[PDB]
C-alpha cells in the first residue's frame, strides 16, 4: 500500500502539532521556583544508629529480660578431657592412652 | 484478549477492547491476567501426552530405584555401649540386651 494524500497531510499536521507540544513540554531555566522556606558524617551515623540501639538493647536485656527465669538460655560450654573448670577450680582429667595406629 | 491483535489502536489498550462492541460473556475469565487460549507451537494433545509420559516414567523409575537401591559393600555402622543405648534415651532402670562388636 502507501500513503494517500489525505493521510500524508494529516500526518504532517499532527507531527507539527506534536513537536510544538513537546517543545512546550520543555522547561525554563527559572522554571523550578522553590518556596523561600566523610569522617564527620560516618561519625555522627555511627554514634546514633549503632551506639544508641546497642545501649538500649543491652539495658533491656541485662535488667529486664534476664530479670525473669529462662528468658535467656545459653547452651552449656563443651568440656573436653584435660581441662580446667573455672567456676569451681576443678580439673577434668585426660583420656586413656591411645593405642598407636600409625 | 491475548489472542486479540496487539498492534491495533484499542480504546482500552490493556484490556484490548473497543467502546460499544459486544463483550464476551466470559470476559472476566479471558483477560490477559487469566486463562489464555492462544495457539501453541505444539498441539495440545501432543503436549499433554509428552508431559504425562515424562511424569509417569519418572515415577515408575523412582519406584524401580526404590525397590533396587544403591549402596556400598560395607557392613552396618557399629556404635559402642549397646549401640548407644543410654544416649538415645534408653531406660536406665532396665538392662538392654548386650550388643558386642568384635575386631576383624
Amino acid at each position: 500500500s502507501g500513503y494517500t494524500p489525505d493521510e500524508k497531510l494529516r500526518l504532517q499536521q499532527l507531527r507539527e502539532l506534536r513537536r510544538r507540544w513537546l517543545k512546550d513540554q520543555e522547561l525554563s531555566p527559572r522554571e523550578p521556583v522553590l518556596p523561600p522556606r566523610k569522617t564527620y558524617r560516618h561519625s555522627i551515623f555511627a554514634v546514633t544508629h549503632v551506639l544508641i540501639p546497642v545501649w538500649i538493647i543491652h539495658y533491656y536485656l541485662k535488667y529486664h529480660v534476664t530479670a525473669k527465669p529462662y528468658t535467656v538460655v545459653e547452651r552449656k560450654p563443651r568440656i573436653f578431657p584435660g581441662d580446667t573448670i573455672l567456676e569451681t577450680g576443678e580439673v577434668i582429667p585426660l583420656m586413656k592412652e591411645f593405642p598407636d595406629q600409625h | 484478549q491475548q489472542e486479540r491483535d496487539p498492534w491495533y489502536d484499542w480504546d482500552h489498550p490493556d484490556l484490548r477492547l473497543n467502546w460499544g462492541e459486544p463483550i464476551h460473556w466470559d470476559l472476566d475469565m479471558y483477560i490477559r491476567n487469566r486463562v489464555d487460549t492462544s495457539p501453541t507451537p505444539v498441539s495440545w494433545n501432543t503436549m499433554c501426552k509428552h508431559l504425562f509420559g515424562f511424569v509417569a516414567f519418572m515415577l515408575f523409575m523412582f519406584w524401580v530405584g526404590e525397590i533396587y537401591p544403591s549402596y556400598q559393600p560395607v557392613g552396618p555402622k557399629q556404635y559402642p555401649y549397646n549401640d548407644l543405648y543410654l544416649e538415645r534415651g534408653g531406660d536406665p532402670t532396665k538392662e538392654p540386651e548386650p550388643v558386642v562388636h568384635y575386631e576383624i
Binding site: - | 489472542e3 480504546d11 473497543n18 467502546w19 460499544g20 462492541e21 459486544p22 463483550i23 460473556w25 470476559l27 486463562v35 489464555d36 487460549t37 492462544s38 495457539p39 501453541t40 498441539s43 495440545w44 494433545n45 503436549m47
Partner: protein
Amino acid sequence: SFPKYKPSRLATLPATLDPAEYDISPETRKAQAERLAIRSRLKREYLLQYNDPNRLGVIEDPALIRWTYARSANIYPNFRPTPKTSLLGALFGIGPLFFWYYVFKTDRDKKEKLIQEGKLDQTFNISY
C-alpha cells in the same frame, strides 16, 4: 508432508491455518466491509465523545452496562427448570455435602471407636 496442528479449546486454531481464510467468496468481502463499517461508526461516536472539551466525567458504555446486567440481574427471569438444569443443580449442590458428611462421619466414628477402645495416643494433648 508436515504433521498437522490439531486445535483444542485452550489451544485454538491460528488464523493462518484456518481453511476458511483461503476460500473467500464475494459475500464474505461484503460481510467484512459491514463489520468494518460498524466498528468505524462505534469508533467515531466514541472519539467524538472522548475529544469533546466540555465533557467531564465517564463515557457510559452501553455494552459494559448490558454485560453487567446480563451476568447478574438477567439470570433468573430466563431460567427454566429443564432436566439438565435440575440434574446439574441437584448434583453440584447436594453431592458435595453428602460426600463430606460421609467422610467426616467415618473419620469421627473411627476416632471415637479408638478412644473408647483406649488405643489412641492422646498423650500431651491438653489443648483442644
